[PDB]
Design a protein around this ligand. Sequence first.
Ligand SMILES: [Zn+2]
Ligand SMILES: [Zn+2]
Length: 85
Amino acid sequence: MAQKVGGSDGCPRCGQAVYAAEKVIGAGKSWHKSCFRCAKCGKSLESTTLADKDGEIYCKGCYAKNFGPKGFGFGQGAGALIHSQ
Ligand SMILES: [Zn+2]
Ligand SMILES: [Zn+2]
């Protein structure tokens, strides 16, 4: 990790370092274009659909796919079991 804010930029993720610069960033990490790994939906991501924090990350694939948490799946869960069933 020499030089700052561009110019030679390596990848803590795959354990390679980049010269052609495929470097992204989050918080103060740096990644490849194709290493960005949401550990929230558990998915390999896309380029510009991401969200960093601290030194981990979840995805704008996620602030997308779950743009609005609440619930969905037909049934509720609290129906008519009534304790004992
Ligand atoms: Zn990488
Ligand atoms: Zn995600």
